[PDB]
A paper describes a structure:
We used electron cryo-microscopy (cryo-EM) to determine the structures of Aβ40 filaments from the leptomeninges of individuals with Alzheimer’s disease and cerebral amyloid angiopathy. Filaments are made of pairs of protofilaments, the ordered core of which comprises D1–G38. The different filament types comprise one, two or three protofilament pairs. The ordered core of each protofilament consists of residues D1–G38 and comprises four β-strands (β1–β4) that extend from residues 2–8, 10–13, 15–22 and 34–36, respectively.
There were two main types of filaments, the minority type (type 1) comprising a pair of identical protofilaments and the majority type (type 2) comprising two protofilament pairs running side by side. Type 2 filaments comprise two pairs of protofilaments that pack against each other with C2 symmetry. Pairs of leptomeningeal Aβ40 protofilaments interact through salt bridges between E3 from one dimer and R5 from the other dimer, and vice versa. A similar association of dimeric filaments into tetramers via electrostatic interactions of the surface residues K16 and E22 was observed in Aβ42 Type 1b filaments. Structures from case 1 reached the highest resolution. The structure of filaments made of two pairs of protofilaments were determined at 2.4 Å; the structure of filaments made of one pair of protofilaments was determined at 2.7 Å. All filaments had a right-handed twist, as established from the densities for backbone oxygen atoms in the cryo-EM maps. The same differences were also present when comparing the previously reported structure of type 1 filaments with the pairs of protofilaments in our 2.4 Å structure of type 2 filaments (not shown). Cryo-EM structures of type 1 and type 2 filaments, at 3.1 Å and 2.7 Å resolution, respectively, revealed the same Aβ40 fold as observed using sarkosyl extraction. There was a strong density in front of Y10, which was situated at a right angle turn between β1 and β2, which may correspond to a post-translational modification of this residue and/or an external cofactor. There was another strong density opposite a hydrophobic patch made of I31, L34 and V36 in the C-terminal region.
Numbering used by the authors:
A (entry chain F), B (entry chain F), C (entry chain F), D (entry chain A), E (entry chain A), F (entry chain A), ...: 1 to 38
Write the structure that this text describes.
């Protein structure tokens, strides 16, 4: 799960970036190419 | 699950970006190509 | 599930982008190509 | 573009799966959330 | 582009899986959240 | 681009898996969250 | 119950305030949110 | 119960304040959020 | 209960304040958040 | 301002109390008995 | 301001109390009995 | 300001109390009985 929050007060600027990310180009907890005999 | 929130106060700027993301190009918890004999 | 919220106060700007996303190009919790003998 | 082909000769089996896929949960070459001032 | 091909000769087996995939949970060459002032 | 090929001769087996994949959970050549002032 | 009384004799002044109050923003002897099983 | 009384004799002044108060922002003898099983 | 009384004789002054108060921001003898099993 | 929320899942009980309150017997931000000469 | 939240999962009990409160018998930020000569 | 949160998982009990409070019988940031000559 993800809980993202951003709260702004008094801000003066030319440029501002806020970047919040969890899974970007990811295979978390994945099973890929499994073989079981029985 | 995802809970995203953004609250603005007093903001003065030329440019501002807020980017919130969870699963971008992802296969979280996926099973791909599994083989079971019995 | 997703719960997205954005609240604006006092904002003055040339450009502003708010981008909220959960599953973009994703196969979360998917089963693809599974084979079971019995 | 896709050019998928499968030819079977002499095959004997309990189970056989052939899985050919392209762009499964994808946004290839897509523009999402773009802003140009002029 | 994809050019997928499979040819079977003399094959005998309990289970056989052939899995050919391209761009599974992908955003290849995508533009997401871009801002240009002019 | 992908050029995937598999040719079977004389094969006898309990289980056989052939897994060919490209760009699985990937953002190759993608632009995410870019800002240019002018 | 309230018994408020003010008697003026010989008084000379720019400003005079007499403030008599009882139960201002009060919940005296109140039952709020009570639960009895039997 | 309140018994408030003020008697003025010979008084000369720029400013005079008499402030008599009882139970200002109070919950005297109140039951809030009580639970009894039986 | 309150019994507040003020009597003025011969008084001459720039400023005079008489402040009589009882239970200002108080929860005297209150029950808050009580639980009994039986 | 007040933002109150309660969400129930799987609940089994003899008795349950949820009590949410902000201003109970309160004079928040109040002016009482002010005197200004000019 | 107040932001109160309660979320229930799997709960089994004889008795449960949740009590959330901010200003109970309070005079926060109040001016009471002020005198200014000019 | 106050931000109160309670999240329940797997709970089994005879009795449970959660009590969250900020200002109970309080005069935070209050001015009471001030006198200024000018």
């Amino acid at each position: 799960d993800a809980e993202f929050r951003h709260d702004s007060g008094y801000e003066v600027h030319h440029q501002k970036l806020v970047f919040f990310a969890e899974d970007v180009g990811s295979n978390k907890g994945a099973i890929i190419g499994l073989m079981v005999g029985g």
